[PDB]
Design a binder for this molecule. Structure first.
Ligand code: 0GX
Ligand code: 0GX
Ligand code: 0GX
Ligand code: 0GX
Lengths: 242, 242, 242, 242
């Protein structure tokens, strides 16, 4: 997370840490609890190549990474069949927990938005995670959960910004329809925040608008953060998630 | 170049080295001389981001990289407008030299194939460059120009190989129509060979089948090297080069 | 710390973490609280070149590094005048805290050994710190305070052991009189433990026998860990410490 | 080599490159031909630990490293018995070639100085090698043999300069009598030049004043380059070299 601050303990109960087995259970990606037995993440975190379920663990809401570790095993890894790279699209994945979680006030699910829900500029939106604080600058220990309020940019305006300083033809789409744009040179998501949630307060309720996907660096000029549009993959999510 | 050996001095007169200004004029990509004043390379070498022409030089055929440097300036960089990433496609670019080179027996152009030209499966072809010898294994000094014989893998067969051990749906194409496959676990192109030529001897004439583009690692199981199909972009090439 | 285990919360109340200002207050060396206002460390940690007082902080006993931080400023950095390198000797330094610490059962001082105290082999001795777990293998998060029981080796035996597979003449002393030897191929101190204490239980009382100084790698054959002999610099310590 | 320029082909015929086996015969240290069958170098290059003769090769004067390789085998490695560390001193070693070198105008021996020569400040002295061009800045390809005119400093002044900005006592010797000082913030030897020669023109004859040994970084304020004083070890060299 570029800019912003450390998140208070009561905020973002849905935020999860994805862990890989090595010298320790290392955080590689973020995620969000969308159902007591289901975690929503980015496909690039757990794909496109087949991963070993034994080498993966899910860590629920934690104020400081690695401190209060209570790792949960994964039953199923479901990656969108249209996924290959974050730039092509379909950067969405589902993780089925071995057993459903005990929902508390400190740890509970995030509400998915309706199919017709469009997130326009000016809407209060926040992105969370334990990712890099800047380009090539990792989150320092004790690795606190960071939060940043990001401004939403319209897809066509964001696509136009991505063409500035690029050879890519103006008619050639960089920011696709299954993507969402948010952030600026001071506020953005980064490497390590991938798979994590982008929540927006719509009529007094928090709705996950996006999934941290990609971008040309972090908080760089004319390069806002790109997220997988949750509304676009609602039919695919509901096929596995009740 | 993975496998093979040091190329003899008389072989591959079209092979060029692309140089970027830093502590020294360092090799970042390969290429091929297609016209005395034009160089064919991969778009990812010089894009999608707009490059500074003063910070770029072209080095003609050299037995040992950096030894007899005769750096040539560039007047134009023409990156295909459909290019953004090597996986999406259109990984092709043209470099116009400031002055046309004096064509000789040691340094001369490569013949481009006709519009209908097909490269059969199992056909022996050659890939050249000063790239890495293996995954995370740089070409050791005095950096000789390397060559390797690579077998052609048909597009549908190669696409199926990329789906082996991947979540990506069988109906979702990884190896695209504007792409070409070549190599195995012992013979392949690698990081640094990008932009370089893939040559096939057809009826006693060397034709450039592909431009080194991408691949999931170098000489990895079920992951052959991906090349930009020259035949697919002949009209775009002929629009700029006479 | 090579080998051993995570130290219990009730053990080593004198253990100190030395912090340097950078992207965060990074641990660079260990230390021991010898007086409520004085910290004993290695000279190579804070020298031989003059350090900025404002860029240094002292962290008292932590079960997990960086998690429960309460950084203390330093008022004086006293490095032994005979110090240049750890191999030459006099690898000892004192850090005066700006204010004295409120002593408790969990955080208290270590007793310095008497002037004529020798530490022969077989004695129950432990070395503590948050250093590397092996050669080029960092202590993984949540960075637990580690301990290891290390066997003491006689100075002349350890000195002759350092000459094994070395061109250095047998008459040329490697392990000097101001040094102490401890550890083996399974039990040792490493990079990051430097400045930390080597404590021995003598007559039911814990005495600081040494200060982590140097060694040819960590837990390598015929290369035990080298410590600064505390008894040798007792007069120098007592000149500043009450 | 920090500062200066690329050496002309006719200059420094005694300069040699020391090679170690791995992915290629990599340069690790410099040296000098003092006798047709003997090479003078620094002890830290080949010690204090015993090295395998088969993994070591000697390369005679080369304008560009690796380009015209004619690797020569070594029969004996003689490291000074007083050596352990460059800072302690005796950083001198002799390498006996398997066969004597066929001496020519391009490749010949350097004259050792008489015992009486102290090399005072103001002598025209040069240091040569293929080492780093600055701190953490490696010599760029085609790796040309570099040279730099370095100002000689008197031992007591160089020792006092090393105490500036250091805790080390003014009466505690840093620069020993078996050492020689040369260089400034623009002209110095660096990592990779170690073992190489420091030559001074005395009575129209090039005499090797020193062997590149150590220093606190390269071209750093009040930290000139430290060389092993050849005259000090003249008796030791003559015990092996005819
Ligand atoms: C022109 C190439 C467009 O495709 C991109 S952007 C891009 C990039 O710059 N990235 C850095 C590091 C990996 C990749 C995506 C990273 C990233 C950016 C964001 C948005 N700031 C969020 C999460 C995240 F992981 C930032 C890469 C590697 C590729 Br391929
Ligand atoms: C699932 C991701 C598919 O897209 C790929 S493959 C891929 C990869 O493994 N590469 C390594 C290093 C960069 C990228 C392409 C590299 C490469 C392979 C080849 C084929 N052996 C030729 C040239 C070349 F530069 C080999 C990357 C970074 C990305 Br994004
Ligand atoms: C010529 C060998 C003697 O001088 C030495 S040993 C030595 C070494 O191998 N070290 C590694 C990394 C730095 C230095 C000291 C390190 C070390 C070893 C120990 C004992 N295992 C304790 C603390 C500690 F920092 C282990 C170095 C850099 C030097 Br100079
Ligand atoms: C205060 C510690 C004194 O002893 C030194 S100086 C010193 C240092 O800064 N060095 C850099 C890298 C290794 C070591 C010696 C290096 C060096 C300097 C020079 C002179 N500029 C020539 C050759 C050479 F290898 C420059 C080290 C590692 C040690 Br241990």
């Amino acid at each position: 997370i570029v800019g912003g601050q450390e998140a208070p303990r009561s905020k973002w109960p849905w935020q999860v840490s994805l862990r890989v087995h090595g010298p320790y259970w290392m955080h590689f990606c973020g995620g969000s609890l969308i159902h007591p037995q289901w975690v929503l993440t980015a496909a690039h975190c757990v794909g496109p190549d087949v991963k070993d379920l034994a080498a993966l663990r899910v860590q629920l809401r934690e104020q400081h990474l690695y401190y209060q570790d209570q790792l949960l095993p994964v039953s199923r890894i479901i990656v969108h069949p249209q996924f290959y790279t974050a730039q092509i699209g379909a950067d969405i994945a589902l993780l089925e927990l071995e057993e459903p979680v005990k929902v508390s006030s400190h740890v509970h699910t995030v509400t998915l938005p309706p199919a017709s829900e469009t997130f326009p500029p000016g809407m209060p939106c926040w992105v969370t995670g334990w990712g890099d604080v800047d380009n090539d600058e990792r989150l320092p220990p004790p690795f606190p959960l960071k939060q940043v309020k990001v401004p939403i940019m319209e897809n066509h305006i964001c696509d136009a910004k991505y063409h500035l300083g690029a050879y890519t033809g103006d008619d050639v789409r960089i920011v696709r329809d299954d993507m969402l744009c948010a952030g600026n040179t001071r506020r953005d998501s980064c490497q390590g925040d991938s798979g994590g949630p982008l929540v927006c307060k719509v009529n007094g309720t928090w709705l996950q608008a996006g999934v941290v996907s990609w971008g040309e660096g972090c908080a760089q000029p004319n390069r806002p953060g790109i997220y997988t549009r949750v509304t676009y993959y609602l039919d695919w999510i509901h096929h596995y998630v009740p």
